């Protein structure tokens, strides 16, 4: 059946803004997962998981009689899709059970692991999400095998359809670099936002870069991908060595024996895949990655044997029974146990990427320190495992259950607890009046509050106005935030604040984070007044101000908007068209297409554009909240053409006289071009729609200002 | 960006069940279009349309100074996508403004027509939908030019995204038949459900079949395509001759001058397409179809000149300035006015498909009668134009405004007015008890009510239980409805009804249509009781019984279910996998994926299968409403394999003993295979889900029962 995407494959796709509707969700409108979780008997679930570990099923027998390694890999792959560039991927929505991730080659046989968990899922039902269960299971596996975990939080609500993620443009699974859709260019530069070296991999190729078994070159890819998953060298070394203290790989026979991945398998497979024709197809004859490596002498127990073996032998290049490159310890005895036959033993083996930890100079220093100080290795791994598995969960206020670690960690972008009375509605009215009497303009107040709040992204729940991080490095210096203008607004707000706080009793004070948002509200109210409407903008206090020392400057860099269509901003020239980037940003803001449309039209007339650009400012009453943007955009008396100087700026001229009326970008004009967007613009550009426009704007403005308010959730 | 559709292009697509969410809709959750339209000043809108007809815009000059012909073609293409096979297409959702229809080659320059209407759309706002306005504008055009229409109903609510319609498998616009994705096979048999001869056409090729200018062969394509749009020979002749009494075609220069369709055009085109480099690109130099024909001597006035010309001349094969085949009157004078230059006249011209009306013997008889009796022609066209433009509106209860015709038309599947008091809640309870005391079983009651209600399709709002047409020809004889079983059920219910109705006072009575539905409600209640649950199934009275004389048997044929997954039924062997046909039927029922899943699982265990098939009946407590289908489907202790006898039937065997536990079809097992459906099945197969399953089942059963109840809307 030929579809619109077949006819017009470069058209903008808005269905990404309308996923996760109440239509696809089997739970009721009122279902609140946090409340269900809070009543789960988590101790009972963990006992069930501990029993499961050694309860081997004949359709996928447990290696060494313990599924711990398999479930550790399962949880690490659940988390390990995360990219810091956009915050997409990660464990937080349980997307490993949906396409495409359930059929990625790197997730081979994790279908078996998740099926092993069905009876537990079934027993506890809606009280534990698949998303939480996958992580909990990894935790239990580590505990079962003697490793003390740092903690666990629940609260990952399940999702019900695949997330729309750009995973790359290749049309061949695991395509090596340099093809027609190469994710690499230049000196091995991986394109943003990708965080894996090949389509269908988690991070790197375990045989080495593009299958070449050079551990030093492998280390470069490990460092680059793990940095794109928010992990530094010490965390990387701790995670890889920690993970490969357990379990084994599976490569018993040639990969040609392995059949269709789950999404391609026949209906009788009932959701499973990779059925193998090699011998019994399972257990001792399992084929997963095609490598055949068992790292330690006790694969089902925490040990310090990984680094003993890594440093204690010299390594020789060999091949697995499937033909894959791997390494074997020279001159070693057969000390590694077999997973099924107690009469066989094996020599120590390693992956190329394991050897990276020794042959890369910076990793070697870490690896040695962990070898000599195994308590440091244990603590580093426990911490890094928690980070890995919770990195996308958002602020600590979302963490549920009795195992949440008390320690506050820098990467969580912590917010101080509020320990004073909040402002009330009378105080909010007094502060808004003070803000309006200071001389700050609608444009300044709007633009500052937009800049503070619009860092939020729903993919990993980082960012937003809570914390007043807009006054700190690096947000205060971002070009999209207009550093000089920002500094002058903040200085005026801080004087208002000081004056209001010095006048209070009983400990009441207002945070700068609250005041920035409140001042934006006053701006919107003033702009509505300028247009003749009486509008009160809702405001919820309770944000607190974070310190510079609570704000990791390097981790904040990924929030910098290099494209923000809502301020008609683009930091440079990109291969992705600006309207694509607009819809991307709207998705991260959690906006639907009607919300994105109203918001953008209102911001243009309020003076939110960076640099006070006139592009899209289709009104003669700037700083008044009207639907002018729509009404003028849709006026057929204007003809549009790209300028000779810049094909991405357009001039709109009177059709009869040729006189120039307006200029716009691609972000502006898409609303007059895309047939779905223009249908939305028509609703707000109609003669009956000025009130609806103002009210819908206020609603969406409020929504954006509250995106990170999980303290009130 | 590579997507799941690229990796697994044959996987079932569930996103079609989750369109039209509240996310994509810019109107409030409470917006009621009928209530907005009922307050529209329709006479004021018509006066504005009437003015527009002769107010030429210089960006698309009006032919002959009058846009009537353009807007008639616009409204006929809005309506003319309709197919009776599925009820999809038609004018009822305003889909011409979205992809792909806005960019079909047969809709070239209708973008200009829609844009001419923006000022009126903007003036009246939400009180008149684009969908209604398109039709209304066609009516006003006809009226302005002296033609008396049969009437107009409003009520077509606007939609906000493209509908998912199968329009054929061709990858090339207008591909001639016989390619790799040919819509034809055998002796020019057009595949169901298609109703056009080439991808991107409304009905037929105006040059003749695959471009071959033979009027006799073209007539075969006209008759076949129009029959597939519910029009017979008399309606067909009346529509084509009627339409081509007005306006002209546009073919002033070579087609290579015409640029990209709207979905492919540049952003600066602002939603318009087919920009032409031929001379001024518009008006006298317009190019649309490539043909250059003007049919009558008064293209802006109703007349009987189409037939005077058709029969009063002999015709010669010629070519337009773009090279298209067309016909010119031999020996004639220059009697046809030019559209822009009052000093030029032209000879009469016709399309090959116009000449079909003369050279096909059955059409010729009708055409002669219309030529000799033009009052019969005007009446037939009026009626056909109303039918065409309202065929997908549904029951008369949905028709709004002051111009609705009072005559009841057989194609409307009319339902008699109710003229007595309805049953109340106590009467409903007495009837339910009487039904259950008769000895009708849960299976019989459920199967009967499902059969009556599940003929509804949301595409054209035909079918449903209102009418009690299940007791009439042809429904009572459809094989899916189990004619002998059905007759015995109906006979018992009619005795119950007679007894109840003979006992009442004050005119109260119950219709058989209501009692069929009620009896199904008693069945579901009893099945819930059988399982330990006390529930009340909601029921709303007020259906009425239609007569055989009010039921067009031939038009009802297209409602027959040849595939009904909800009853595990497939009438024969098809190219489309059964699971695809299930999701197709769910879409026509207006069901989401969660609703589909609950409904199917419940119907299995209630005994709804045709023939009492045991396929998918995964329970040992048949006729009890439990979640057994899901619990047993998801049990990993059962292994599934296709049977040697039939690859589409599967045996489920105990994995350990090999004992046969169940059988199922592809429809059954898709819920254990497809990763999104199996995530839904898991929620209903969990241990905490039996109350949820009962409640959600009752809700979706009630939704189905009420699909055609637009009297209560
Ligand atoms: C450079 C990074 C890494 C690479 C290239 C990599 C590669 C792989 C490969 C190829 C397998 C074998 C799959 C099979 O054939 O069954 C595997 C197994 C596994 N990995 Fe990793 N790994 C990486 C990092 C991780 C990390 C960060 C963890 C966890 C903290 C982890 C834990 C595991 C465990 C537990 C197994 C054993 C599976 C079992 O016993 O069934 N690895 N690794
Ligand atoms: C066999 C069925 C039909 C065929 C092949 C057909 C073909 C076409 C073609 C090729 C054009 C010229 C488009 C252009 O170049 O501007 C057109 C114009 C038109 N058609 Fe049809 N037609 C059919 C039936 C209908 C029907 C059923 C109606 C309405 C009741 C309709 C009303 C018109 C009108 C009013 C125009 C003139 C548009 C203008 O003045 O701009 N036609 N037809
Ligand atoms: Na994420
Ligand atoms: Na339809």
Q: Which residues on chain A are in Cβ contact (under 8 Å) with B594?
A: 24-26
CATH of domain B408-564+689-713: 1.10.520.10
The C-alpha torsion from B47 through B53 and B58 to B60, rounded to 10°, is: 130
Return d(Cα B352, Cα B357) in angstroms, integer. 9
CA atoms of B16 and B590, how far apart (whole Å): 10
Question: If residue B372 lies in a helix (H) or strand (E), which one and from where to where?
Answer: helix B361-372
Rounded to 5°, angle at Cα B444 from B438 and B446: 115
Buried b (16+ CB within 10 A) or exposed e, B651-665: bbbebeeeeebbbbb
Task: List, in order, residues 6 or more apart from A15 with CB less than 8 Å away.
Answer: A164, B15, B161
Q: Are B367 and B237 in contact (CB under 8 A)?
A: yes
Residue B653 parent element (H or E): strand B649-654
How far is residue A614's CA from residue A592's CA, in Å, rounded to a whole number?
26
Q: How many Å lie between the alpha carbon of B325 and the closest alpha carbon of chain A?
A: 28
Distance CA A32, CA A713 (A): 10
| Distance of alpha carbon B133 from alpha carbon B696, whole angstroms | 38
Q: Tell me how close the Cα of A263 comes to any Cα of chain B, in angstroms.
A: 7
Q: How many residues does chain B have?
A: 713
- Read off the tokens for A546: 């974070």
Cβ pair A154, A400 in contact under 8 A: yes
Residue B82 burial by Cβ neighbours in a 10 Å radius (0-12, 13-18, 19+): buried
User: What beta strand segments (E) does A252-395 contain?
Assistant: 315-319, 325-329, 336-337, 345-346, 349-350
Residue whose CB lies within 8 A of the most ligand 1 atoms, among A111, A216, A243, A359, for a mutation test: A243
> Quick one: which of B534, B527, B526, B417 has its CA closest to B467?
B417
Residue B76: its H or E element: helix B68-79
Instruction: With beta carbons less than 8 A apart as the criterion, state whether B450 and B608 touch.
Output: yes
Spell out the CATH class of B565-688: mainly alpha
The DSSP result for B611-650, as a single string, is GG--TT---SSTTS--SHHHHHHT-TTEEEEE-SS-TTEE
Dihedral sign, CA of B323, B328, B332, B338? negative
Token pair, residue B209, equals: 């079949």
Q: Which ligand has the shortest distance to the CA of A205?
A: 1
Residue holding tokens 């940095």? A227
The dihedrals phi and psi of A336, each to the nearest 5 degrees, come to -90, 135
Phi, psi of B110 (to 5 degrees): -75, -20
What 3 state SS string does A468-521 have?
A: CHHHCCCHHHCHHHCHHHHHHHHHHHHHHHHHHHHCCCCCCCCCHHHHHHHHHH
Strands A569-570, A563-564: pairing is: antiparallel
Q: Kindly tell me the sign of the dihedral angle through the C-alpha atoms of A628, A629, A635, A638.
A: positive
Asked if B230 and A632 count as a contact pair (C-beta separation under 8 A), the reply is: no
Residue A175 has φ and ψ, to the nearest 5°, of -55, 130
B244 is in an annotated binding site: yes
- Catalytic residue, from B66, B77, B250, B615: name it: B77
**Distance from the Cα of residue A421 to its chain's centroid:** 34
CA-CA-CA-CA dihedral for B226, B232, B233, B235, to nearest 10: -90
Residue B712 CA neighbour count, 13 Å, CB half: 12
The residue whose CA is least distant from atom 3 of ligand 1 is A240
Query: Across-strand partners of B327?
Result: B317, B350
Give the orientation angle of helix A442-453 with respect to helix A690-705, to 10 degrees.
50
**B625, B524 in Cβ contact below 8 A?**
yes
Spatial CA neighbour of B45 closest among B143, B126, B120, B122? B120
Which chain A residue has its CA at the smallest distance from B636's CA?
A: A115
Q: Are A526 and A446 in contact (CB under 8 A)?
A: no
DSSP, res A402: T
The method of structure determination was: X-ray
**Mutate which of A23, A30, A654 to test chain B, going by most B C-beta atoms within 10 A?**
A23
Pick from B92, B83, B105, B327: nearest CA to B224: B83
In the numeric block, which tokens belong to residue A172?
């061949």
B193 prior amide bond cis, ω within 30: yes
Evaluated on CA atoms B49, B55, B61, B64, the torsion sign reads: positive
On whether the CB atoms of residues B122 and A683 are closer than 8 A, the answer is: no
Hey, where are the domains in chain A? 1-167+373-407, 168-372, 408-564+689-713, 565-688
Contact B690, B602 (CB under 8 A): no
What's the CATH fold of domain B168-372?
Peroxidase; domain 2 (1.10.420)
Spatial CA neighbour of A37 closest among A154, A119, A123, A117: A154
b/e sequence A613-641, b meaning 16+ C-beta within 10 Å: bebbbbbeebbbbbbbbbbbbbbbebbbe
Q: How far is CA A461 from CA A393, A412, A451, in A?
A: 7, 10, 16
d(CA A224, CA A186): 15
Of A482, A486, A504, A506, whose CA–CA distance to A494 is shortest?
A: A486
> Is B98 in Cβ contact with A679 (below 8 Å)?
yes
- Do residues B288 and B355 make contact, with C-beta atoms less than 8 angstroms apart? no
Query: What are φ and ψ of residue A376, in 5° steps?
Result: -65, -35
CB atoms within 10 A of CB B519: 28
Q: Where are the alpha helices (DSSP H) in A268-318?
A: 305-312
How far is the CA of B615 from the CAs of A367, B627, B643, B664, in angstroms?
Answer: 60, 16, 13, 4
Q: Do A158 and A37 form a contact (C-beta atoms < 8 A)?
A: no
* Alpha carbons B116 and B54: distance in angstroms, whole number: 12
Question: Which ligand places an atom closest to the C-alpha of A386?
Answer: 1
Q: Which atom of ligand 1 is nearest to the CA of A385?
A: 30
Residue B351 Cα to ligand 2 midpoint, Å, equals 10
Which residues have CB under 8 Å from A425's CB, separation 6+? none
Q: How many other C-beta atoms lie within 10 A of the C-beta of residue A241? A: 24
How far apart are the C-alpha atoms of B160 and B94, rounded to whole Å?
A: 9
Cα–Cα dist B712/A463, whole Å: 48
C-beta B73 within 6 A of ligand 2 = yes
CA A162 from centroid of its chain's CA atoms? 14
Q: Name the residue among A621, A588, A592 with its Cα closest to residue A607.
A: A621
Backbone φ/ψ region at A464: left (φ over 0), alpha (ψ -120 to 50), beta: left
| Residue from B580, B693, B683 nearest B626 by CA | B693
Residue with tokens 């599925």: B86
Under an 8 A CB cutoff, do B169 and A7 touch? no
What Rg do the C-alpha atoms of chain B give, in angstroms?
Answer: 28
Residue B243, ligand 2, Cβ within 6 A = yes
* Fold of the CATH domain A1-167+373-407: Peroxidase; domain 1 (1.10.520)
Q: What is the rounded CA–CA span in Å between residue A47 and residue A521?
A: 51
Apex A549 CA angle, A544 and A550, nearest 5: 45
CA distances from B505 to B37, B421, B424, B500, B502 (A): 40, 10, 13, 11, 9
Q: For every residue of A3-58, which 3-state class applies, written as one string?
A: CHHHHCCCCCCHHHHCCCCCCCCCCCCCCCHHHHHHCCCHHHHHHHHHHHHCCCCC
Q: How far apart (Å, rounded) are the C-alpha atoms in residues B585 and B593?
A: 12
Give the integer Cα–Cα distance in Å for A145 and A138: 11
- The values of phi and psi at residue B642, to 5°, are -70, 145
Supply B273's token pair.
């397409």
Q: Is the CB of B352 under 6 A from ligand 2?
A: no
Pairing verdict, β B638-642 and B649-654: antiparallel
* Cα B469 off chain centre by: 20
What's phi and psi for B303, nearest 5 deg? -165, 180
Rounded Cα distance, A107 and A73, in Å = 9
Report yes or no: A170 and A181 within 8 Å, Cβ to Cβ. yes
The tokens for A206 are 């375990």
**Ligand 2 midpoint to CA B289 (Å):** 10
Cβ A14–B161 below 8 Å, yes or no? yes
Tell me the three state secondary structure of residue B18.
Answer: coil
Residue among A248, A327, A326 at smallest CA distance from A288: A248
Gaps in chain B (C to N distance exceeding 2.5 A) after: none
CB contact under 8 Å between B122 and A687, yes or no, is yes
Closest atom of ligand 2 to CA, residue B109: 16
Q: Which residues of chain B does A1 touch, with a Cβ-Cβ cutoff of 8 Å?
A: 166-169
Buried b / exposed e over B582-597, threshold 16 CB at 10 Å, is bbbbbbbbbbbbbbbb
Do the domains at A168-372 and A408-564+689-713 have one common CATH topology? no
Place of tokens 């692991």: A113
Buried b (16+ CB within 10 A) or exposed e, B312-330: ebebeeeebebebbbbbbe
Q: How far is B99 from chain A (nearest CA, A)?
A: 7
Strands, E, within A96-194: which ranges?
Answer: 184-185, 189-190
């Amino acid at each position: 059946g030929t579809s619109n995407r077949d006819w017009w494959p470069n058209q903008l796709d808005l269905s990404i803004l309308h996923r996760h509707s109440s239509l696809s969700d089997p739970m009721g409108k009122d279902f609140n997962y946090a409340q269900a979780f809070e009543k789960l008997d988590l101790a009972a679930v963990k006992r069930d998981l501990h029993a499961l570990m050694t309860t081997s099923q004949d359709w996928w027998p447990a290696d060494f009689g313990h599924y711990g390694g398999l479930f550790i890999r399962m949880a690490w792959h659940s988390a390990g899709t995360y990219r810091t560039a956009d915050g997409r991927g990660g464990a937080g929505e349980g997307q490993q059970r949906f396409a495409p991730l359930n059929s990625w080659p790197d997730n081979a046989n994790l279908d078996k692991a998740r099926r092993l968990l069905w009876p537990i899922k079934q027993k506890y039902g809606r009280a534990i999400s698949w998303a939480d269960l996958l992580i909990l299971t990894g935790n239990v596996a580590l505990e079962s095998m003697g490793f003390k975990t740092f903690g666990f939080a629940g609260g990952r609500a399940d999702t019900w359809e695949p997330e729309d993620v750009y995973w790359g443009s290749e049309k061949i699974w695991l395509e090596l670099s340099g093809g027609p859709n190469s994710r690499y260019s230049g000196d091995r530069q991986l394109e943003n936002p990708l965080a894996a070296v090949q389509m269908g991999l988690i991070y790197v190729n375990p045989e080495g870069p593009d299958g070449n078994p050079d551990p030093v070159a492998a280390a470069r890819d490990i460092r680059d991908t793990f940095a794109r998953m928010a992990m530094n060298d010490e965390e990387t070394v701790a995670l890889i060595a920690g993970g490969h203290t357990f379990g084994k790989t599976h490569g018993a026979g040639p990969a040609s024996n392995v059949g269709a991945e789950p999404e391609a398998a026949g209906i009788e497979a009932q959701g499973l895949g990779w059925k193998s024709a090699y011998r019994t197809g399972k257990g001792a004859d399992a084929i997963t990655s095609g490598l055949e490596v068992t790292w330690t002498t006790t694969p089902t127990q925490w040990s310090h044997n990984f680094f003993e073996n890594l440093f204690g032998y010299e390594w020789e290049l060999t091949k697995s029974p499937a033909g894959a490159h791997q390494w074997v310890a020279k001159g070693a005895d057969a000390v590694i146990p077999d997973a099924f036959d107690p009469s066989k033993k094996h020599r120590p083996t390693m992956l190329t990427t394991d050897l990276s930890l020794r042959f890369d100079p910076a990793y070697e220093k870490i690896s040695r320190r962990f070898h000599e100080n195994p308590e440091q290795f244990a603590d580093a791994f426990a911490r890094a495992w928690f980070k890995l598995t919770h990195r996308d969960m958002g602020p600590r206020a979302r963490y549920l259950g009795p195992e949440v670690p008390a320690e506050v960690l820098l990467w969580q972008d912590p917010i101080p607890a509020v320990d004073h009375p909040l402002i009330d509605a009378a105080d909010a009215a007094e502060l808004k009046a003070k803000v309006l009497a200071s001389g700050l303009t609608v444009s300044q107040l709007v633009s500052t509050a937009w800049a503070a709040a619009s860092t939020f992204r729903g993919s990993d729940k980082r960012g937003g106005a809570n914390g007043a991080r807009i006054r700190l490095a690096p947000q205060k210096d971002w070009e999209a935030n207009q550093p000089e203008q920002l500094a002058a607004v903040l200085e005026t707000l801080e004087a208002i604040r000081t004056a209001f706080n010095g006048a209070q009793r009983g400990g009441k004070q207002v945070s700068l984070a609250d005041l920035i948002v409140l001042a934006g509200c006053a701006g919107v109210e003033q702009a509505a007044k300028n247009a003749g409407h009486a509008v009160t903008v809702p405001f919820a206090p309770g944000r607190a101000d974070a310190s510079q020392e609570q704000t990791d400057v390097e981790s904040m860099a990924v929030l910098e908007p290099v494209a923000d269509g809502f301020r008609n901003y683009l930091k440079g020239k990109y291969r992705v068209p600006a309207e694509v980037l607009l819809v991307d940003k709207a998705q991260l803001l959690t906006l639907s297409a009607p919300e994105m449309t109203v918001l953008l039209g209102g911001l243009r007339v309020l003076g939110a554009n960076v640099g006070q650009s006139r592009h899209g400012v289709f009104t003669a009453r700037e700083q008044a909240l009207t639907n002018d943007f729509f009404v003028n955009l849709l006026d057929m008396g204007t003809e549009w053409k790209p300028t000779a100087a810049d094909a991405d700026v357009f001039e709109g001229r009177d059709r009869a006289t040729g006189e120039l009326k307006w200029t716009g970008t691609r972000v502006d004009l898409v609303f007059g071009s895309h047939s779905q967007l223009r249908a939305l613009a028509e609703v707000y550009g109609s003669a009956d729609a000025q009130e609806k426009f103002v009210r819908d704007f206020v609603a969406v403005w409020n929504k954006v200002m509250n995106l990170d308010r999980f303290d009130l959730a």
